[PDB]
Amino acid sequence: GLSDWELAAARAAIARGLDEDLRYGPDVTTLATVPASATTTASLVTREAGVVAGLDVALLTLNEVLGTNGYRVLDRVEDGARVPPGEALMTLEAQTRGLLTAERTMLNLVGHLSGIATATAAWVDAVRGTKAKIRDTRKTLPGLRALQKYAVRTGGGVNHRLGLGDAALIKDNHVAAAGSVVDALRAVRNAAPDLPCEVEVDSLEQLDAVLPEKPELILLDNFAVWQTQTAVQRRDSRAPTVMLESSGGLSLQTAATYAETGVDYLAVGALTHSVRVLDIGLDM
Amino acid sequence: GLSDWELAAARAAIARGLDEDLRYGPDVTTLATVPASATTTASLVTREAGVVAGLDVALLTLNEVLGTNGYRVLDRVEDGARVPPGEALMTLEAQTRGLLTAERTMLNLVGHLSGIATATAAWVDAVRGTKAKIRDTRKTLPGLRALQKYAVRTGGGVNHRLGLGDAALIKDNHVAAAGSVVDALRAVRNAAPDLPCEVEVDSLEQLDAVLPEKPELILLDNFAVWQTQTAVQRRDSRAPTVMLESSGGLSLQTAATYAETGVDYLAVGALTHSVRVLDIGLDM
Numbered sequence: 001g002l003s004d005w006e007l008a009a010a011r012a013a014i015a016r017g018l019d020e021d022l023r024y025g026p027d028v029t030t031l032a033t034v035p036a037s038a039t040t041t042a043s044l045v046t047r048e049a050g051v052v053a054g055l056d057v058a059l060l061t062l063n064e065v066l067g068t069n070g071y072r073v074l075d076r077v078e079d080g081a082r083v084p085p086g087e088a089l090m091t092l093e094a095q096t097r098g099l100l101t102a103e104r105t106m107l108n109l110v111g112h113l114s115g116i117a118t119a120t121a122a123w124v125d126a127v128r129g130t131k132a133k134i135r136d137t138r139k140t141l142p143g144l145r146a147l148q149k150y151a152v153r154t155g156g157g158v159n160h161r162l163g164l165g166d167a168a169l170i171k172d173n174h175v176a177a178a179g180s181v182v183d184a185l186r187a188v189r190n191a192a193p194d195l196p197c198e199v200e201v202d203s204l205e206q207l208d209a210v211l212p213e214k215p216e217l218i219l220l221d222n223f224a225v226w227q228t229q230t231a232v233q234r235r236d237s238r239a240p241t242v243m244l245e246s247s248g249g250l251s252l253q254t255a256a257t258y259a260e261t262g263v264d265y266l267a268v269g270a271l272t273h274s275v276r277v278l279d280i281g282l283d284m
Numbered sequence: 285g286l287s288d289w290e291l292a293a294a295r296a297a298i299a300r301g302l303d304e305d306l307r308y309g310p311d312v313t314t315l316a317t318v319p320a321s322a323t324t325t326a327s328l329v330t331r332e333a334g335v336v337a338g339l340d341v342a343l344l345t346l347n348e349v350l351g352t353n354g355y356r357v358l359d360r361v362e363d364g365a366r367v368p369p370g371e372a373l374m375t376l377e378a379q380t381r382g383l384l385t386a387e388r389t390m391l392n393l394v395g396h397l398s399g400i401a402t403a404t405a406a407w408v409d410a411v412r413g414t415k416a417k418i419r420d421t422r423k424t425l426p427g428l429r430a431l432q433k434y435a436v437r438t439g440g441g442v443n444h445r446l447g448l449g450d451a452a453l454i455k456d457n458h459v460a461a462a463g464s465v466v467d468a469l470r471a472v473r474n475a476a477p478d479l480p481c482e483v484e485v486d487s488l489e490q491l492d493a494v495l496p497e498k499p500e501l502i503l504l505d506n507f508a509v510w511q512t513q514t515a516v517q518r519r520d521s522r523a524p525t526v527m528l529e530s531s532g533g534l535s536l537q538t539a540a541t542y543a544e545t546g547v548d549y550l551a552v553g554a555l556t557h558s559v560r561v562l563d564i565g566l567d568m
């Protein structure tokens with residue numbers, strides 16, 4: 001379900017996409033070969049297996065090109081469906097010219113979003129049987145954040161930060177300016193008491209230092225599995241309320257290893273930067 | 285070098301990015317811990333090897349956040365440089381708060397554009413010693429086409445179609461409506477005699493059928509290496525002037541094999557959809 005916020009991001013995205021395509025003129029070739037009165041039944045069918053996402057975004061692209069009632073949906077799959085290869089995600093009847101113009105933007109969008117959801121479902125499978133939840137980052141493509149965040153949620157992950165003012169995140173730079181990790185922490189505690197504290201540590205010594213300050217979340221930046229295990233042992237005994245999120249040296253191969261240490265979350269930048277498209281085509 | 289068209293796309297992209305980050309509020313934590321008079325020397329350094337692209341976009345993000353003269357570039361590498369792991373792509377002196385605000389958006393963009401130029405340079409190496417050129421497609425992310433197209437060119441690729449009105453591309457759908465591949469070809473020849481013809485064939489039978497019509501470029505859709513060789517043999521003998529471009533079942537492992545058949549280009553959709561970020565950090 002696209003929130004009004006997401007729905008707005010989608011429209012803006014679909015508009016930017018159509019504008020890139022039409023900027024150089026209309027599809028001279030459909031115009032030349034296919035009549036304005038032509039109508040077809042087309043299907044978005046997967047060329048591979050995965051988790052579908054962004055189907056509503058496909059519909060919104062048609063609204064923009066054909067008008068809300070310019071097409072008919074004979075059938076569709078729900079976003080989040082695990083889908084086998086030749087699956088028909090959505091079947092529609094629409095003026096042929098409109099379909100052909102909307103095609104590329106619509107496939108680009110849903111192929112991208114399904115790619116993310118597919119990847120996140122893999123991560124979510126990898127740590128099944130563990131308490132860890134898979135979470136995203138702000139390492140998103142400019143202009144697509146709302147959509148990419150939507151896709152990880154669709155694949156079963158949980159959204160983390162939406163931007164700079166979401167929560168207070170004390171990093172290396174801040175600790176420095178404050179003097180120390182506890183310094184930065186206290187400062188922020190007073191500046192934005194209403195805001196969730198998250199502190200990024202890159203060593204076990206920094207971990208020990210902030211643990212007593214009891215921030216909401218500690219990010220273990222590039223810890224080996226063994227240091228992660230230690231981190232959890234320490235948190236469990238000293239500051240039970242602090243959440244721990246692994247961030248950094250994560251691969252889908254190691255994901256379960258990290259998950260079994262008992263960390264609460266896995267921060268996966270790859271879900272949004274580095275995405276592999278889910279291959280989909282429009283079959284007429 | 286960003287063209288004025290690319291420069292605008294860059295600005296648009298950096299603007300959308302910043303708006304997503306600042307939509308929820310300013311970086312309350314830098315505000316709280318770092319003074320406005322603070323100034324640092326920071327470096328954009330790669331965590332991995334690749335080909336750099338999008339450095340001007342980094343500077344543009346700073347212009348937007350610190351003002352044109354809010355920073356000083358002490359040193360920078362040229363776009364298109366092959367770069368080793370700990371390489372400092374660019375070293376600057378700027379106001380600390382500004383750097384921290386720009387950071388994520390800046391890294392997300394150059395990371396993406398470098399990821400692309402990196403992958404495209406690998407394809408280019410792959411077909412080295414062949415006459416083939418690596419080309420992109422319209423399988424771009426919405427709002428980023430101009431930038432993505434820029435990066436492939438930086439990696440050594442050559443840009444293909446920028447949009448729907450670029451050239452006349454007769455596909456299956458057009459062939460259908462026209463009746464046959466030749467039908468459509470003729471149709472468009474009459475409708476837009478000024479525009480470049482490109483016809484997509486998925487069989488050697490279609491190839492033989494269109495070859496005599498002498499289109500500017502024939503796209504071999506999902507041809508085996510053996511059928512691509514054949515296609516080259518026929519074009520070479522029947523219509524020497526016709527260019528050929530392999531599209532579809534291409535993998536970096538098969539690239540050279542396809543290239544050795546003598547095709548003129550390889551159309552790689554993965555260069556722009558499916559991109560893996562070049563990991564880069566801002567070190568202060």
Ligand SMILES: O=C(O)c1ccc[n+]([C@@H]2O[C@H](COP(=O)([O-])O)[C@@H](O)[C@H]2O)c1
Nearest residue numbers: 137138160161221247248267268269270
């Ligand atoms: O701002 C956030 O919400 C956020 C939360 C957790 C992690 N991150 C970033 O995500 C990185 C780890 O994932 P990856 O795959 O990008 O290496 C981590 O080291 C940070 O640079 C960002």
Ligand SMILES: O=C(O)c1ccc[n+]([C@@H]2O[C@H](COP(=O)([O-])O)[C@@H](O)[C@H]2O)c1
Nearest residue numbers: 421422444445505531532551552553554
């Ligand atoms: O419109 C263009 O400039 C364009 C030029 C060459 C190829 N394409 C598309 O790119 C496809 C091949 O790349 P890929 O990685 O997406 O399978 C090809 O079969 C077409 O459907 C698109």
